[PDB]
Amino acid sequence: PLVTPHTQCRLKLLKLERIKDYLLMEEEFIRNQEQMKPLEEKQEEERSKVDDLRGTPMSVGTLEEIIDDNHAIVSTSVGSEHYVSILSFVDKDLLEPGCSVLLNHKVHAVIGVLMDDTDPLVTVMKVEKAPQETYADIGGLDNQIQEIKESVELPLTHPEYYEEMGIKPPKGVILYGPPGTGKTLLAKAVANQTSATFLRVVGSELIQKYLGDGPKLVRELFRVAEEHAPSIVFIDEIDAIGTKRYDSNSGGEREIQRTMLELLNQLDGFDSRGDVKVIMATNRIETLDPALIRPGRIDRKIEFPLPDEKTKKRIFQIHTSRMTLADDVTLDDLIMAKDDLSGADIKAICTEAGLMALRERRMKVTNEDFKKSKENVLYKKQEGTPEGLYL
Amino acid sequence: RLEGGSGGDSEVQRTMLELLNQLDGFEATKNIKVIMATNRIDILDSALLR
Amino acid sequence: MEEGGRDKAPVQPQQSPAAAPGGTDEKPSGKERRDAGDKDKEQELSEEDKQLQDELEMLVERLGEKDTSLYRPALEELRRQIRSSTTSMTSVPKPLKFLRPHYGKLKEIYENMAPGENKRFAADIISVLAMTMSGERECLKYRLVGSQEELASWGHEYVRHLAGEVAKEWQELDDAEKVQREPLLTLVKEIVPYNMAHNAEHEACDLLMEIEQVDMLEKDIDENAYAKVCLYLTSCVNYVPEPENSALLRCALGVFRKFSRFPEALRLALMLNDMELVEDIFTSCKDVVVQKQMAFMLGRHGVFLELSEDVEEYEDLTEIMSNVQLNSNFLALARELDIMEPKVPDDIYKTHLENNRFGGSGSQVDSARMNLASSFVNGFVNAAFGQDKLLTDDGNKWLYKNKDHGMLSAAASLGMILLWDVDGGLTQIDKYLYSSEDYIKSGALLACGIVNSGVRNECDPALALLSDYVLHNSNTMRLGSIFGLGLAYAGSNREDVLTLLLPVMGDSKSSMEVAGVTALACGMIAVGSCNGDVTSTILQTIMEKSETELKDTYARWLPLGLGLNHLGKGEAIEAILAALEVVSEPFRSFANTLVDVCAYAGSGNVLKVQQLLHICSEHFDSKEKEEDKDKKEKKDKDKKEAPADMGAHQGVAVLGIALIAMGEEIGAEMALRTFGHLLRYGEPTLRRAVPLALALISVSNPRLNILDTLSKFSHDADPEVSYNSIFAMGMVGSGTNNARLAAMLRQLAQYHAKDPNNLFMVRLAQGLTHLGKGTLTLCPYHSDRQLMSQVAVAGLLTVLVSFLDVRNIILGKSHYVLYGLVAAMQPRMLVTFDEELRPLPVSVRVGQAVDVVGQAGKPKTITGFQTHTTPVLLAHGERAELATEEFLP
Amino acid sequence: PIRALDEGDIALLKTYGQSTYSRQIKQVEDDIQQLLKKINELTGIKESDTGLAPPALWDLAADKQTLQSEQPLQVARCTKIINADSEDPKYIINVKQFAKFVVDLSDQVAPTDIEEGMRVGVDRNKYQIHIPLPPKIDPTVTMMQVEEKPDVTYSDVGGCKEQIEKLREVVETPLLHPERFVNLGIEPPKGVLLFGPPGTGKTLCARAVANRTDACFIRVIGSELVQKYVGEGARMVRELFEMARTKKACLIFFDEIDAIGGARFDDGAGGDNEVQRTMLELINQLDGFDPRGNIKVLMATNRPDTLDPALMRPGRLDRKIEFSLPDLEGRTHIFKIHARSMSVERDIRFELLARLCPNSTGAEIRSVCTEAGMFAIRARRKIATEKDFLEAVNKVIKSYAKFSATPRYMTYN
Amino acid sequence: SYDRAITVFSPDGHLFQVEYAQEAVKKGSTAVGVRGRDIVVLGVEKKSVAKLQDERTVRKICALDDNVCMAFAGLTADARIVINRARVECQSHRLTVEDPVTVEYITRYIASLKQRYTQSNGRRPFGISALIVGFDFDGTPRLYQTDPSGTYHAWKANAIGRGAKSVREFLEKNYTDEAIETDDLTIKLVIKALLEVVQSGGKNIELAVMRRDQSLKILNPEEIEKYVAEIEKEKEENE
Ligand SMILES: Nc1ncnc2c1ncn2[C@@H]1O[C@H](COP(=O)(O)OP(=O)(O)OP(=O)(O)O)[C@@H](O)[C@H]1O
Ligand SMILES: Nc1ncnc2c1ncn2[C@@H]1O[C@H](COP(=O)(O)OP(=O)(O)OP(=O)(O)O)[C@@H](O)[C@H]1O
Ligand SMILES: [Mg+2]
Ligand SMILES: [Mg+2]
Question: Which residues are registered as beta bridge partners of A113?
């Protein structure tokens, strides 16, 4: 992530060709690795007959009980239960009733044991790519940047400060405020610069219709996070997961309400938690369940207000990084004159003014682009609130 | 987004939050464009109008 | 689509150049005046860079391309003025008249005759007219001429001054970030004759500006971070005179032309050392120019400042040599007893207290080889004045109890207790010296070289350890006497005691470990001349190693001093010297990869890195040259630790996947010493990737291979929270990972991270990036650990006192003459700023705020405020001078 | 009158401004991302190795014995027996998934141990009984028998000197002195509900009695009772209330019984039907015919209003212990619990801190104790001062509890 | 939850409908005021003329009696009732007791009239806050303030309206214990205080002073422009 000239300079032509040099050599070295292998023994006769000892259509079974005389009991998908033996090379030390095993068809015998057993709905929510830029991307939020770093990055990088006072770091963080402020950016910048793994949850993702399929996916969600790295979990748009826990008349409302009541249990209920951090985000905060807002579950409440006349300069500066800017413009024209508008408004102004230059056959962008752009973006919010009663 | 209680609707919002997020979530999409067309400008929600 | 009605320019400049063949002949006025009316108007519709779409420039050539093909050549009677009207008007649209094979024909309109002073109609326009087109000429057209035929025709002759005025024009129009476009122009034009381009561009820059020097100045050294061998040879000496001739910032000479010492010429920086002795005004920049000249990148400068001004202007030499060294001892004496440290912490051993209740009871460990590691509760914590009377009683009993190699080891630990000392360091040894034993005196008098290491004053050039050496008829008196004095005089390149200790090589007394460390002792001294050392080593090498096919005591020690005597030059003559000198059998051609890449400390020479892979890649090699592919991988570890992190991410990407993943003896035995050589800072990417292959011990091999990778997993200094890994692996490492072999090792790894509180700079990077070797003192240890049987007998000479080039730590002191000032310094996560808006904010981590001797840390360019001007060298370097000035109200 | 695009004017744009390095820098970035892919499929080192033992021990088995245990070994199934008839086998056997057969015994059996309701190994071809089995134990109650001590002493539940006193009477005292109840002529209650505001200490009292129990203790995961299949959740209730009768005096802790049924209604003809069957099965094995004897039930909820009056009846839930907020003497004891194990100044007072938390819980008090040390890491300290706690009270409470009453305060002094 | 009544209490003892009346004060234009040695001064901001109206009917500064002033915030309707009522009491006091009316007596009337106006249901309280400045009580300069709860209170320098928290924090670091004599210096303190306006247009400041012996002296936008010039003269010392 070092393309730091950020412009059409020969350094970025030199830097990226260095990256081309190392990856081509990494290709050619592993190309030589699968090339110059004159070693063939292929099992030394042991695993080769074993791979022929097991059946070729390997099937999947489920343990019920363990009769340890090398003759145990299993269960199939339909529930057909078979007094099968243990055809060998399996240590009887990691097989428990519930752990799924590997079976045959002709004799149904236990050949291996199936590992990791993840239902392929939680593996979709496992992020592999760092999407965007680092903390230097966003346009100045440094009082609240230092807050989230105290609970996520700093306890993982340097947990020597906390043992000197015996204080565990905070676990839950709420991001709340008006829309268009930077909630989704602050999660993506953390997921960029991190060392542990990352999990994203899009709102109504853990909602199904089979009346028990809802809460069952939540158990496997925290199970995967606990079994893997000391990592964090980002669950966004939790306004569709909690509203004050009232009792009413609809029957599909309860399997909604029950799944959202056992997330409470997995979070800060019985004995332990592990090193799992949870980051949650909404637009509205007052319509939430007060059982989730209490400390023990969430220890940080972070406001994201609409910007000022000072850090707004940093918003216009970053979104006008790589565009040809004519020297006629003043950034403080649109900032000081109008004092209401979000950070997502400013990105729309910079894109619209660039479209106005091609609209009148230009490359550079003058003040007259921003005069028409600041109009056209802002005409989507209504006229006003009350007449001159107050003075 | 109305209130809770036995009023408004949750499930209308449950679908709406996914529309609110598959184009603006953790993963930004490319080469997919949406067109929305309706009257009654002031009564659709101020989270997809941003 | 509102076309039509206002298409004036797609009609009348569609007709009048179409009527130009209708009015060239039989119309002498319409040939000229309509051309001039075409020329100025097409010139006028391009000068505003606020209409890129030109109503002529992509409207006329739809017929005008076939017109110009019949107007410029086919006229054949071109006048003196009509060529200045045709070529001035028709060389403008030719980048967009023509497609991507324009690159051979930017000349069939232009170079018929370049009309006059082409910037006359291209001055105020930035690059739309011809300046992009000028770069298109210097890209392809000049390079095919200047590939072998630089001295050539009009494509070089006028093109020189044509590129001269264009390079002036980049810093003329707007003076924007197109300043850096001039090195984009100067280096593409005549890549190898860059200096022939730069010599005109040096003098042009000298008269260009004195404020718009510095960002182009750092643009050069960013391009000089990696290049070809000849480009790094060329643009670094072009870099030298710009703070010498244009400006006189000039305190960036000494270390930032140590950049240019080894590549261009050793005497050239000595002529720049002469240029240091020219600009002697007045003291403050002069002081900190010569602060680095002793113990920051090299020593050996104490012979050139005893000339005719020996009062205070040349009496800084001994002050540089040992007094500011002793003022640095006054850091560890005064300031570092103040911050943290009483005389004996002695309690990282006591931090193993909670283990005795973890699982019932304790007091089960009684291994005698743990008592080797018991010396490092006293040994490592007592560096920088951890002086101990009767706190060495754990040493004093175990010295007089057993363990002859530990009698040498506990005696060698006394030199680490009194380090950087000349005042009373020998007096501490003398009471613990007279025991009349082989092992006691050979460890203590080797430690005497450690005490006066970095001093290089008159302590014992041949006084003590030469008299220790001539006592030999026997064991380590023969060995341990030559090692300490070459360790003490490693910073020097003195010839005399090298010739005193050359008959150690010429004795042919066949003690093998003595001759091996003899190559290591002479290797630490010199890096340049004295080819007779290369002669002396290979004589006994051909005598001894030819009549054997055996252990690496031959191989790990004897070619290594050859590589240390020829370290750090990418000339590739040293490979022609060494490899054609030891043309021999392949177990002696193990030494082929040593002196090849020891001259290749750090640069971008990726063509070497592929021959560092492709020759001996895998082959599966049934137990014949497996040492050579480890040592070929050993030389992959350097040439990676100083392109400044550009290849470090690529190094951890390749060596994590390729070897430890799809390897064999190369990966699962040896390929973790990269991480024990790449960085010593620590970060949880590689610090957690090593216990992926360590918590999985993979015990089927001789597991001390993987437990060697345990050992220098803790080869990261600057103490951390890594105690969680080592103590928990020490808990599984007591019973399992048996304590007979590595109970010394895990606590060697445990006790080395908290060596002192401070003094962790062992990482070969000073100022910003320069080496300061350094390398000659560390690299013997990672060459030593190949692999086993030196955990017991022979490597105990090495494993304690191998690397001893720690230079101090911290950039907190002020030294304004009385040394009373503290500062207001402001420490931050390091710079990222390369080219952005002026001025550029240097760093990003504003939270930490100290005044005085606080820490260095991994990426810290610590700045200061309160208008003290910090004027000294404006880089940093831990002995700032800090004058005072406030003329801004 | 605004139109500015025509295919010739497209060729104006991508030649003006850095024609040298535009594609020259771009395709280098393009093919390296192609090369990010082409390394990955060239590696292909996924390696999901599992099932295999260390390959130094099974060598004796997979020489001939594995081939000897293919054809002579049997793939026999297990079943259940209804009954038998005299002078003959006449064995009537079901599967509950397959059909019901009437089969013969084999030669390798003793005809005595073919008792009714017994799991037996059954042939695949002629379906003869070969091997009788031990009875089935329920697999998921074994998963939720805790077998583990969470470490919370009663000295950490400060502010609740009387709520523990009520809870000590029901759980601990009949299990250690079952005399004074009989020797006076009373019976202890058998069901205790816990209700009140969240974060008040519901889980702590349940976590602390799991420490000092000396008895069978069963945590019950609440949403395991809700299943996908019809009637499956009601069968899970039964197996729980059978094995409790086997051993003596086992403790069962439910938690958040709001989820497993709160109200019984039917107006839209449907809804939470399967939840009601599991919930009513819980009732009839709580009271009814066959009283349970020595089974103590603990429940805890945050929303006690929305529960069924069938559970509100005493005889099922007998003691209503509620948790309130500690007045002042409770909170001053709570600060001394959560701040004794941290580096503080040894001269500060805590009663001034307990003033400024008027309506607060035990969770909110601990959040102040953790936050005050976080201010010490904002500065560079290793001990907490008085103003560290005073800023922490404004950070936790006053940043969310009041914003109009603090600046415009002048109605009260 | 429970507010919707001025007679009910919260479970933690509050009157939210009284507290909501102070929220209506924060929609008003800011007005500051200090006392000095002899000359008291108060200024208002945010004139914002709208090109088509007469500006002598939008006045925010009035006089109750000959030696007492008034500046307010909130909404314009409720201020007109309080002003017109207070003119009667400061005139009927003079009839019953032949003294002039002190500045302390008229503030207790405004607070007590707003007091009983809060107690009874079906009586919406006044959503205004006022500044009473008068150097009337025997040559002594004083200034008080009010509150919609009905609590009269005395400051030495005051700020109200939309943005009072910045100005009140500004004056604490600016009001010197050195008494601002040479009263144009004290007037320049207010113009420096009103320089932190919501937009600071310069020509939107209506300062009104009183030299404690004459009547009210409304400043013109030529004398006030001279004081804005000398504020930029002292600002030239930053370079
Ligand atoms: N402080 C900021 N600096 C720079 N860019 C910003 C900032 N705030 C918002 N943006 C812009 O806003 C976009 C991100 O939207 P944001 O993170 O505000 O969504 P959100 O808060 O999740 O909105 P919603 O709550 O409606 O889902 C980015 O494209 C970014 O360019
Ligand atoms: N009386 C108390 N004394 C000491 N600490 C307390 C007390 N009450 C609560 N705490 C602290 O508050 C934290 C959270 O309390 P807990 O979650 O047990 O409350 P709860 O009532 O069980 O919550 P819920 O009703 O949501 O289940 C506990 O970890 C405990 O440290
Ligand atoms: Mg969002
Ligand atoms: Mg609880």
Answer: A101
